[PDB]
Design a protein around this ligand. Structure first.
Ligand SMILES: Cc1cc2nc3c(=O)[nH]c(=O)nc-3n(C[C@H](O)[C@H](O)[C@H](O)COP(=O)(O)OP(=O)(O)OC[C@H]3O[C@@H](n4cnc5c(N)ncnc54)[C@H](O)[C@@H]3OP(=O)(O)O)c2cc1C
Ligand SMILES: [Mg+2]
Ligand SMILES: [Mg+2]
Length: 312
């Protein structure tokens, strides 16, 4: 027995309201994976030298990332440890909402998540249960050379070391608690901090007329939008992996920058939000229609549809 949700069955609607994502907790992960309830792993952004060689250190200074999905119970336990109550509809990693939201854009990227409603809180928890080639290293390396740790109050490329923000964000009728990795911060951490946060990306530069470039930027936007990240800073590199150009974007500016280039068919920020809000309402309706602790999988395998299965 399958339940299916059609991207294209969603009528043209007004873009749903989305609240300013509010940080309710944060934590750091040491290089050794120790989970610390502090900001010791929040780094500051500082522009690296132009023509930096992103190959430097690959592979002998590269500690490849863990490469196993993290259970979302980590985040539930963080909130429990700090005595924060979960009064929302969804609890998951930011990147798993990005996957739902951007699925219309990415027929090639197939994924599967696991959902269970928590019996005490009633929130729907979602996780994966199921990245270190030279291309990804350039990404990790750009993050490394573009950041500065806290020093006053306190090289190898260790993507396992991370800072994480946990936000409350409302998308239409769905209240979500989302945990996501924050690459660094623009200035002193305050007022809600997320607009101060920065996402770092590395990419070849293509014109905005290029459909692939637009799709990539839309995914950049979606990711940072879901965590309230104020800035996305792109290190443009050439085919040799040399840093050529720094581009500082404000997240809210990406939908504006792309407006003159969308073709009449294209997926737009507003269309993506409309569909996402319908998908979330559908997931919620389907799950709540059962007793808590019932396990489901949410799958996308190409085409136009999400499929929710009850696990037995
Ligand atoms: C089989 C499998 C292996 C995974 N291995 C890792 C891992 O080694 N480290 C990790 O942080 N998360 C890994 N994940 C994903 C985590 O379970 C979790 O969803 C995620 O870490 C939550 O953090 P978000 O900030 O919401 O992740 P996202 O919004 O999805 O991505 C943010 C950043 O997390 C990093 N990241 C995300 N996914 C992976 C991945 N699959 N492998 C390596 N780095 C990744 C990467 O630097 C990425 O930056 P960028 O987008 O610029 O490339 C894995 C998932 C699966 C299914
Ligand atoms: Mg990182
Ligand atoms: Mg990044």
């Amino acid at each position: 027995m399958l339940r299916e949700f059609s991207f294209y069955d969603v009528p043209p609607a007004h873009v749903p309201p989305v609240s300013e994502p509010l940080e309710i907790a944060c934590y750091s992960l040491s290089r050794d994976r120790e989970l610390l309830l502090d900001d010791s792993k929040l780094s500051y952004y500082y522009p690296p030298p132009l023509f930096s060689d992103l190959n430097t250190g690959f592979p002998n200074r590269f500690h490849p990332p863990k490469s196993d999905p993290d259970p979302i119970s980590i985040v539930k336990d963080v909130l429990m440890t700090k005595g924060i109550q979960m009064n929302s509809s969804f609890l998951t990693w930011r990147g798993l909402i990005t996957k739902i939201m951007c699925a219309p854009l990415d027929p090639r990227n197939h994924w599967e998540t696991y959902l269970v409603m928590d019996p005490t809180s009633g929130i729907i928890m979602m996780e994966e249960r199921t990245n270190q080639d030279r291309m990804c290293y350039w990404g990790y390396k750009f993050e490394a050379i573009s950041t500065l740790p806290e020093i006053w109050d306190a090289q190898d490329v260790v993507p396992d070391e991370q800072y994480c923000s946990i936000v409350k964000i409302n998308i239409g009728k769905s209240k979500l608690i989302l945990a996501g990795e924050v690459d660094c911060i623009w200035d002193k951490k305050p007022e809600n901090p997320n607009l101060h946060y920065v996402e770092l990306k590395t990419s070849k530069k293509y014109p905005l007329e290029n459909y692939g470039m637009r799709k990539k930027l839309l995914k950049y936007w979606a990711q940072s939008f879901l965590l309230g990240i104020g800035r996305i800073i792109i290190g443009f590199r050439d085919d040799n992996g040399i840093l050529i150009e720094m581009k500082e974007l404000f997240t809210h500016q990406i939908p504006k920058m792309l407006r003159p280039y969308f073709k009449p068919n294209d997926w737009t920020p507003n269309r993506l939000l409309v569909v996402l809000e319908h998908a979330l309402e559908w997931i919620k309706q389907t799950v709540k229609q059962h007793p808590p602790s019932t396990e489901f999988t949410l799958s996308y395998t190409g085409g136009s549809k999400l499929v929710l299965r009850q696990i037995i």
